[PDB]
Structure formats: C-alpha cells, structure tokens
Amino acid sequence: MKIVAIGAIPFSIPYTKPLRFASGEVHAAEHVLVRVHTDDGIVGVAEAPPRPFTYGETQTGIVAVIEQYFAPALIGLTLTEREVAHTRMARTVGNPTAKAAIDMAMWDALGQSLRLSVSEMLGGYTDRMRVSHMLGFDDPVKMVAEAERIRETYGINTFKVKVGRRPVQLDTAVVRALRERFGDAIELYVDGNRGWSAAESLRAMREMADLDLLFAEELCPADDVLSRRRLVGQLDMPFIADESVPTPADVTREVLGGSATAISIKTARTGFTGSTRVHHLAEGLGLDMVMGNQIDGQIGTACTVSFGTAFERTSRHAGELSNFLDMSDDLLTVPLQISDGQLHRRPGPGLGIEIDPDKLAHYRTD
Amino acid sequence: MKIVAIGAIPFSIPYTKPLRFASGEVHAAEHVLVRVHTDDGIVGVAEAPPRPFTYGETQTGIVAVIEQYFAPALIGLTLTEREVAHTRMARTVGNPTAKAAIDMAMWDALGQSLRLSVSEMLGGYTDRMRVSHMLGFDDPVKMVAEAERIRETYGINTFKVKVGRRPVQLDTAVVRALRERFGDAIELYVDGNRGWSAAESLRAMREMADLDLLFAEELCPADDVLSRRRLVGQLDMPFIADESVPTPADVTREVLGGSATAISIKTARTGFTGSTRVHHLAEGLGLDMVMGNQIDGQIGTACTVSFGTAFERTSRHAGELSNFLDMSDDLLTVPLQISDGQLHRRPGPGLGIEIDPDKLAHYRTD
Numbered sequence: 001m002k003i004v005a006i007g008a009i010p011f012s013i014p015y016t017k018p019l020r021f022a023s024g025e026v027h028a029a030e031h032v033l034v035r036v037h038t039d040d041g042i043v044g045v046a047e048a049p050p051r052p053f054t055y056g057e058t059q060t061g062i063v064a065v066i067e068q069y070f071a072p073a074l075i076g077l078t079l080t081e082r083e084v085a086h087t088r089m090a091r092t093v094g095n096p097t098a099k100a101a102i103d104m105a106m107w108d109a110l111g112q113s114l115r116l117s118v119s120e121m122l123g124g125y126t127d128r129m130r131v132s133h134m135l136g137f138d139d140p141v142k143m144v145a146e147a148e149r150i151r152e153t154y155g156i157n158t159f160k161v162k163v164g165r166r167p168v169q170l171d172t173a174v175v176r177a178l179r180e181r182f183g184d185a186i187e188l189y190v191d192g193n194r195g196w197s198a199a200e201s202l203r204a205m206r207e208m209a210d211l212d213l214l215f216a217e218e219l220c221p222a223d224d225v226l227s228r229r230r231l232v233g234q235l236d237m238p239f240i241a242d243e244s245v246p247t248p249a250d251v252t253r254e255v256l257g258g259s260a261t262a263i264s265i266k267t268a269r270t271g272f273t274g275s276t277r278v279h280h281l282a283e284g285l286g287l288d289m290v291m292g293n294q295i296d297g298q299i300g301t302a303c304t305v306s307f308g309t310a311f312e313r314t315s316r317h318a319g320e321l322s323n324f325l326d327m328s329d330d331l332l333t334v335p336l337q338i339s340d341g342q343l344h345r346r347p348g349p350g351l352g353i354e355i356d357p358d359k360l361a362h363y364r365t366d
Numbered sequence: 367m368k369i370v371a372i373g374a375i376p377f378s379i380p381y382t383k384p385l386r387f388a389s390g391e392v393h394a395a396e397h398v399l400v401r402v403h404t405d406d407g408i409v410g411v412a413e414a415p416p417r418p419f420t421y422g423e424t425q426t427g428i429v430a431v432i433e434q435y436f437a438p439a440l441i442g443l444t445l446t447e448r449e450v451a452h453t454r455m456a457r458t459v460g461n462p463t464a465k466a467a468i469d470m471a472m473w474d475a476l477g478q479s480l481r482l483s484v485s486e487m488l489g490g491y492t493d494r495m496r497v498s499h500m501l502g503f504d505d506p507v508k509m510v511a512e513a514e515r516i517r518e519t520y521g522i523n524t525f526k527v528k529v530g531r532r533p534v535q536l537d538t539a540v541v542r543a544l545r546e547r548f549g550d551a552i553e554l555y556v557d558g559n560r561g562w563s564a565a566e567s568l569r570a571m572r573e574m575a576d577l578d579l580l581f582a583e584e585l586c587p588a589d590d591v592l593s594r595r596r597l598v599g600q601l602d603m604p605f606i607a608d609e610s611v612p613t614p615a616d617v618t619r620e621v622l623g624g625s626a627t628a629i630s631i632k633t634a635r636t637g638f639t640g641s642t643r644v645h646h647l648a649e650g651l652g653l654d655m656v657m658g659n660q661i662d663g664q665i666g667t668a669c670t671v672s673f674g675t676a677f678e679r680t681s682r683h684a685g686e687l688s689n690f691l692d693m694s695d696d697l698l699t700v701p702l703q704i705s706d707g708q709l710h711r712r713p714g715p716g717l718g719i720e721i722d723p724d725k726l727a728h729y730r731t732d
C-alpha cells in the first residue's frame with residue numbers, strides 16, 4: 001500500500017443552471033480530479049473544487065501545488081502513514097481543497113485495499129443521512145418553485161436558503177414564502193455568505209423570528225470582528241461558521257472569541273483526517289456541527305456522506321448533499337441517488353465510487 | 367468481523383516491589399483481562415487496571431459492568447461500528463478502564479483481522495517512543511539509586527518523580543539530588559497525585575526553580591478549585607492534569623477554567639477511540655499532551671505505545687512506558703523490551719501481542 005504517484009487532472013462540466021450566492025457564483029464545475037496510485041495497482045480518487053471567493057484557490061493553482069509540492073513530498077509513504085502525510089502537507093499553508101483531496105483519495109485507496117468503506121473505517125455510526133438542499137439566489141417565486149420541485153422529486157425536507165441580498169426584505173420575504181408554503185413540514189435555515197452587515201443581519205433575523213429558523217450561517221463577515229461577535233450574542237439559534245473556520249485553529253479562535261456558536265464541517269476543505277480533528281474539537285467544546293456543501297460534484301458528495309454517516313454528531317442533522325443535481329453531468333459510473341430525502345453511504349469499499357473513463361476523457365481540460 | 371462474545375477475566379500478579387505515591391499504593395496487578403471474540407475466530411485483548419484512588423473502579427466492579435452491561439450491549443456489532451459501541455457505552459457513566467479495555471480489545475481484533483498494527487491504523491506517525499519512568503516514594507538515597515539503575519540498565523533518560531509528601535523539603539531534596547547526580551543528561555518532572563495543598567506546591571516549585579523541571583503534574587487537588595487555578599497561573603512550565611481530566615468534557619472545563627495547562631493522555635482510561643478525541647481536542651485548543659502510565663502491566667503498555675507512536679504531538683515527548691518492570695511476571699508470550707531508552711510499537715497486527723495460556727491459567731482468580 002505504498003504511494004507510487006499522485007495526479008491532478010483538471011476538468012470542467014457545465015451547470016444546467018448556475019448557483020448564485022452573496023460571495024460569488026458557480027456556472028461550471030471547474031474542478032480537479034486527484035488520484036493516488038499505489039504499488040498494489042489501486043487508485044484512490046477525490047476532487048478539489050477551486051473556490052477563489054472562499055479559500056482563494058484556483059483550478060490552475062490546485063494542480064500546481066499538488067504536482068510541485070504535495071506529490072513529491074508524499075510519494076513513498078504507505079496508506080497507513082496518514083499522520084506523516086498530514087504533517088508534511090501542513091508545512092504548506094492554506095491550499096485546503098488540494099490537501100483534502102489528497103487525504104480523501106488516500107482513504108479511498110485504503111478502503112479499497114482493505115475491502116472496507118471509508119464510512120465504516122471512520123466509525124460506522126449509521127448508513128445514511130437526511131439531505132439538505134441549498135437554494136441559490138433567484139426571483140422569489142422561482143426559489144419557492146425550486147424548493148417545491150426538489151421536495152416532491154427527491155423527498156428532501158430541509159433547505160438552506162441563500163441570503164445576503166439588498167434590500168434585506170427581499171430575502172426575508174423568500175424565507176417567509178417558503179414557511180407559508182410548506183408549514184412545519186420542512187426544516188429551514190439561512191446562509192448569508194458574508195453578504196449582510198451585522199446590523200442588517202439582526203434586523204433580518206428579527207423579522208424572521210416567527211419562522212423557526214434552525215441556524216444562521218455566516219450572515220455577515222467574520223472579519224467585521226466586533227460587530228460579528230455582538231450579533232452572534234444576540235441570536236437565539238446557533239450561528240454556523242463556515243468559510244471563517246477552515247482549520248481547527250480557526251474553530252478555536254472563533255468559538256472562544258464569540259464569533260461562532262456552531263461549526264460547518266466540509267470534507268472538501270478538511271478531508272477525512274482533518275474533518276475528524278474538527279469533529280472531535282467541536283464535540284469536545286460542546287458545539288453543534290453540520291455537514292456542509294462546497295458546491296460539490298458527486299465525487300465530493302460521496303465524501304461528505306462517507307464522513308457524515310461515521311459519527312452521531314454529524315448524522316443527527318441533515319447534510320448538505322444535493323447541489324450536485326444542478327450539474328449537467330458528472331464523472332461517476334454510477335450516479336448518486338437521493339430518495340425519501342436521504343442519501344445512503346456507498347456500499348462499496350473506499351468511497352464506493354468509480355470514475356467513468358469516457359466521462360473523464362470528455363471533460364478533462366489538460 | 368462481528369462480535370460474538372466479550373469476556374472479563376480477573377487476574378493477579380504480585381509486584382516485586384510496591385509502587386507508592388500520594389494517592390495510594392500498588393502491591394499487585396489485580397487487573398482484568400478483557401477479550402473480544404469475533405465470528406472469524408479472532409480474539410482481541412486488553413487489560414483494565416482498577417484504580418479506586420483514581421477512578422473509583424474495583425476489580426470486581428469492572429468484571430460486573432462488563433458482564434452485566436457492556437457485553438450484552440455490544441455483542442452483534444462489527445469491528446467497524448466503533449462509534450456505535452462508543453455511543454452505547456457512553457449511556458453508562460464513568461467506568462473508564464472497563465470501557466477503554468473493550469475499545470482497545472476491539473481495535474486489537476480489528477488490526478488482526480486486517481493484518482495492520484493499531485499504531486498504523488491510528489496514523490502511523492512513527493515507530494517508537496522515548497521512555498519515561500515514574501519513580502515512586504522511597505528513601506531519598508533509594509530513589510536516586512533506582513533512577514541510576516534504570517538509566518544504566520535500560521537507557522531511560524526521562525524520569526517523573528512522585529512527590530506530594532510532607533515535609534515538602536523531603537521531595538524537593540530528592541529532585542535536587544537527581545539533578546545533581548545526572549546533570550542536564552536527563553529530563554525531569556514531578557507528579558504530586560493531589561498530595562500537596564496549592565500553597566505547599568508553589569513553595570516546592572519555587573525551591574526547585576533552578577532544577578529545570580519540564581512539567582508539574584497534579585501537585586494539588588483539582589477540586590481545591592480556586593487555589594488550584596491560582597497555582598497554575600503562577601507556574602512557568604505547563605501543569606499537567608491527569609486524574610482530573612478523565613474525559614474530553616473535563617479537558618474542556620479544566621483548561622478553560624485555568625486549572626490545567628497540559629494534558630495527560632492514558633489509554634487505560636480513554637482507550638484508542640476516546641484517546642483520539644482527547645488528542646484532537648488538546649491539539650485544537652493548543653495544549654501539550656503526554657502519554658501517561660496507569661501503573662500498567664505489559665498489556666496496557668503495549669496499548670500506550672500503540673497510540674503514542676501514531677501521532678506527532680504525543681511522540682514529541684517521552685511516554686511513561688516502564689513501570690511494568692516492577693511486576694514479578696506478566697501475561698505476554700513475548701515480553702516488552704526497552705533499549706536505549708526507547709520502546710518500539712509492536713511489529714505484529716493489532717497490538718502485536720499474545721496472551722500466554724499458561725500464565726493466564728496460573729494468575730487468573732476466577
């Protein structure tokens with residue numbers, strides 16, 4: 001189980017409909033397929049989604065850091081030297097998805113080598129997660145229509161509404177329309193992607209005080225430090241930190257500083273080894289955690305569910321596992337299936353997925 | 367890899383020389399051998415040391431909780447459902463070594479089933495740890511003689527001196543004698559096992575200010591809450607919490623409250639699943655951690671080194687891995703070997719140990 005090579009292949013798949021939010025937009029999945037090859041002939045895979053408006057990574061940059069720094073530093077290690085790989089990669093600052101992809105591909109290879117799913121190796125608490133869908137910006141009537149379509153089609157009963165627009169009433173009207181249309185039959189929460197000021201955020205949440213929102217996520221910039229802390233202290237529900245807590249150290253600083261009262265865990269940025277560190281830190285501190293979506297393709301979603309199903313604290317909440325549906329196509333030989341508002345972790349070893357050679361050949365851009 | 371049975375066998379092995387400390391004494395290893403049997407014919411093992419003066423467990427009590435509560439609740443689970451086992455056992459409060467032993471025996475069985483060492487499955491950072499020996503109470507001249515014997519015989523260069531006696535000068539004289547006898551060729555730190563008051567502790571440490579002590583461990587009771595916090599804030603070096611932080615929640619309360627500035631990790635009380643939770647919490651908070659000794663037999667020591675070698679943060683410090691030497695005999699077919707002041711993790715799958723049938727038959731007390 002020795003790593004003989006690590007590759008980074010850029011690919012691009014158009015979105016049927018772009019996902020828009022306060023911090024940016026995604027019109028295509030311009031990701032990087034990361035592959036870890038072992039001396040046993042096994043190939044572990046994962047993807048790295050470049051999100052310049054979240055981490056500052058670019059597709060070109062991810063391929064570069066992997067080919068120029070990480071691959072050379074990890075070749076020669078075995079799949080059971082994860083902490084050596086973790087420590088070596090840590091010598092390089094940032095580059096979250098590049099690091100996470102390598103870690104997850106290593107876990108995929110390990111699982112295949114041992115005939116065990118990543119989920120069970122991590123803890124195997126359960127076999128499925130409830131699904132939460134992120135509703136991107138769009139005309140009010142269109143967002144409600146999208147929610148209705150998704151709920152009826154896939155049985156999804158949890159929605160995270162993208163907000164952070166002006167005037168604030170535009171978003172509060174959308175959330176109210178959703179609650180009036182579905183009643184208490186659905187769970188609702190919001191994500192502002194740093195779009196509102198702390199003051200606007202409070203006014204918005206106060207207006208929606210009767211809508212039973214479960215969480216408030218990154219309503220204002222965490223970097224508006226003092227006003228952010230004041231806002232978090234004013235809200236009843238937990239305030240989920242996401243882009244502001246990419247590492248365990250950030251979790252500690254933001255939580256102890258009062259700028260976060262809940263934590264988003266995204267395998268796209270902390271993989272499995274790093275995500276376990278976040279889960280354990282959050283559980284130890286006593287904070288709620290939710291599996292988030294990095295506007296993942298099916299490869300990344302398979303990773304999210306692999307980790308989320310491994311622990312009780314992550315599976316007690318719905319996981320954001322459905323935005324891949326807006327992609328026009330994907331790279332798996334067998335597409336992920338969401339039914340009854342749930343997504344099961346794959347039954348196969350590792351991530352339980354396989355890359356379709358024809359799809360990769362068609363969408364790769366190298 | 368399904369668990370078909372879990373047994374708890376009490377055994378007793380006399381100590382060649384008793385280990386004495388502020389909170390109690392150990393004259394024999396009256397432990398419990400815990401065995402996890404799988405449907406593959408594999409048997410994972412671990413031990414549970416009853417320490418009434420530390421956790422309140424008794425040999426009889428450990429066997430009882432395992433046979434009456436834990437075994438019935440875990441039979442039927444697979445070795446890859448560790449989080450289910452963790453959650454089910456958590457329904458019962460306390461009983462740390464009983465829980466830890468089951469967890470470690472499960473990991474041992476898993477390793478054997480996969481032909482992988484526990485160390486590598488946990489992270490595989492390194493293959494060995496430097497060794498630290500705990501020097502129990504005894505005449506000043508005799509403690510120095512013991513240190514000299516151990517250093518020359520095994521190459522051990524780190525010693526944790528047991529203190530907490532009155533007058534305080536008795537212990538400070540011992541530590542000074544050790545530093546004068548060995549110079550800077552050895553690492554030294556102290557453990558008071560709650561024996562001194564916070565005021566006595568400060569006076570003692572001030573008297574030893576020129577002895578370059580690396581850590582101060584549980585000098586006074588953590589339950590002398592406010593004076594404990596004042597003391598911790600007065601000391602230069604990290605103050606290791608041990609018996610006061612048996613769970614991650616305790617780590618959080620004691621660290622945020624200021625009663626601890628370093629954390630002892632003992633596999634005897636948190637096993638491997640729980641110990642990973644402690645390591646990740648401590649690393650995330652940014653605190654030093656040291657692998658401690660629960661006055662372990664060789665079975666427990668094999669567990670300590672399995673975990674300690676898996677991570678960088680634990681292996682950067684010497685691990686307390688040598689007090690089993692004072693036992694008159696043990697249960698392994700192949701005894702642990704300490705050379706050049708180091709202990710390597712076992713090369714075999716799981717814990718890399720095997721119970722000698724003849725030894726178990728002779729020392730069991732059921």
Ligand SMILES: O=C(O)C[C@H]1C=CC(=O)O1
Nearest residue numbers: 051054242292293294295
């Ligand atoms: O913020 C989210 O949870 C969803 C998405 C928006 C940007 C991003 O990278 O993640």
Ligand SMILES: O=C(O)C[C@H]1C=CC(=O)O1
Nearest residue numbers: 417420608658659660661
């Ligand atoms: O305190 C230590 O580190 C050593 C020992 C003393 C009591 C116990 O159970 O552990």
Ligand SMILES: [Mg+2]
Nearest residue numbers: 191217218242
């Ligand atoms: Mg978010």
Ligand SMILES: [Mg+2]
Nearest residue numbers: 557583584608
């Ligand atoms: Mg101690």
